[PDB]
Design a protein around this ligand. Structure first.
Ligand SMILES: CC(C)[C@@H]1NC(=O)C[C@H](O)[C@H](Cc2ccccc2)NC(=O)OCCCCCCCCCCCNC1=O
Ligand SMILES: *[C@@H]1O[C@H](CO)[C@@H](O[C@@H]2O[C@H](CO)[C@@H](O)[C@H](O)[C@H]2NC(C)=O)[C@H](O)[C@H]1NC(C)=O
Ligand SMILES: *[C@@H]1O[C@H](CO)[C@@H](O)[C@H](O)[C@H]1NC(C)=O
Lengths: 241, 97
């Protein structure tokens, strides 16, 4: 393990609303750049680097996409883990060092709809489950695949329809990153029922930060991801499948 | 060498692993979140209004020999949810043990 000394952190005393009540986790450990740290608190990974607790200042995520699989995932601090990807890593430069922000060349539904047609900005976010894009573009996307609105920018798809949906490909650094319908849809359960959630959510992030697409756990699940602070870049390889 | 931190997966929607805060370490589960830059966990001093705190692990600074007080107030707003509290300083272990 590692011991990061003299780390400044929040002791939470108020959590209004419901989002943290039924969450499985106690807290959040942020791993983006110092620029977006509230109170300018030096982040954990930044402290770890300053204390030279790893040799390579990179970290990597494997996320399992079978909800019952063991292990559920792995974060590797200071390295990548070959157990969880096939082939070589392909890299993109970070554009704005705040979030882990990169240039997205386009998003294409196989049946022909193209979003982000002339390129746009995206962030790579382990802390959101779904892909996120602008409300209007996501609406078009969901219409193309036959999903229907649920609530707050989320959409559902009849489970028996999933296997015949078109693939959706994100173009990053000139390479295509395909998501099958199985990759971009999620099983959800409540009270003994099963439904299929569309893995794209519509949400408008205002300037100056936005607009932004978000590559969430849907993407990172298919594509093992490396976050590299030495070279300010993000790397993707096909995850173990 | 590189440090592995195994994660749990709940319903393909929440991924989280165990860390330690303090000496000796008090264990907490956290999302390792590449869309933010702060660490926080619930305090033993959380308000009685904070229902989430009732059923999550709580940090007790009195039990940590490496704790250093800060006390500055913080508020964080995410896309889903908000919280506030105060800052503290301690040793963070990954994994917890
Ligand atoms: C920098 C932070 C103050 C904050 N970051 C986030 O909101 C993104 C983060 O990944 C959270 C993590 C999370 C996980 C579980 C429970 C709660 C929080 N994901 C989160 O909130 O996921 C929901 C959808 C993603 C949208 C995030 C960006 C929109 C801007 C929000 C206002 C500025 N704040 C933010 O951008
Ligand atoms: C609360 O912690 C912050 C850091 O998160 C302290 O501010 C830092 O203190 C050192 C030494 O005074 C400086 O070298 C840093 O540049 C400061 N950084 C920032 C961003 O403020 C702050 O002093 C602490 N406050 C209290 C009251 O303990
Ligand atoms: C990516 O960043 C590095 C370091 O800043 C730079 O040398 C290189 O030219 C950049 N690559 C591209 C494709 O812009």
């Amino acid at each position: 393990g590692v011991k990061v000394e003299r780390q400044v952190f929040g002791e939470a005393t108020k959590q209004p609303g419901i989002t943290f009540i039924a969450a499985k986790f106690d807290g959040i450990l942020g791993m983006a750049y110092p620029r977006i740290s509230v109170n300018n608190v030096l982040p954990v990974f930044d402290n770890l680097m300053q204390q030279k607790l790893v040799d390579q200042n990179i970290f990597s995520f494997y996320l399992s996409r079978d909800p019952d699989a063991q292990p559920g995932g792995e974060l590797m601090l200071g390295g990548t883990d070959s157990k969880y990807y096939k082939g070589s890593l392909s890299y993109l430069n970070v554009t704005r060092k705040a979030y882990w922000q990169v240039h997205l060349d386009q998003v294409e539904v196989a049946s022909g709809l193209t979003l982000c047609k002339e390129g746009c900005e995206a962030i790579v976010d382990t802390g959101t489950s779904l892909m996120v894009g602008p409300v209007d573009e996501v609406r078009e996307l969901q219409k193309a695949i036959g999903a229907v609105p649920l609530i707050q920018g989320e959409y559902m798809i009849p489970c028996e329809k999933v296997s015949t949906l078109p693939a959706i490909t994100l173009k990053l650094g000139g390479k295509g990153y395909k998501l099958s319908p199985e990759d971009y849809t999620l099983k959800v359960s409540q009270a003994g029922k099963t439904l299929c959630l569309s893995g794209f959510m519509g949400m408008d992030i205002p300037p100056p930060s936005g607009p932004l697409w978000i590559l969430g756990d849907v993407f990172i699940g298919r594509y093992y991801t490396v976050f590299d602070r030495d070279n300010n870049r993000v790397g993707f390889a096909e995850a173990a499948r | 060498g590189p440090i592995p931190e195994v994660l749990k997966n709940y319903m393909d929607a929440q991924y989280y692993g165990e860390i330690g805060i303090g000496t000796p370490p008090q264990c907490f589960t956290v999302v390792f979140d590449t869309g933010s830059s702060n660490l926080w966990v619930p305090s033993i001093h959380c308000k009685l209004l904070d229902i989430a705190c009732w059923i999550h692990h709580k940090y007790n600074s009195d039990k940590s020999s490496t704790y250093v007080k800060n006390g500055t107030s913080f508020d964080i707003h995410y896309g889903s949810g908000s919280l506030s509290g105060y800052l503290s300083q301690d040793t963070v272990s990954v994994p917890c043990q």
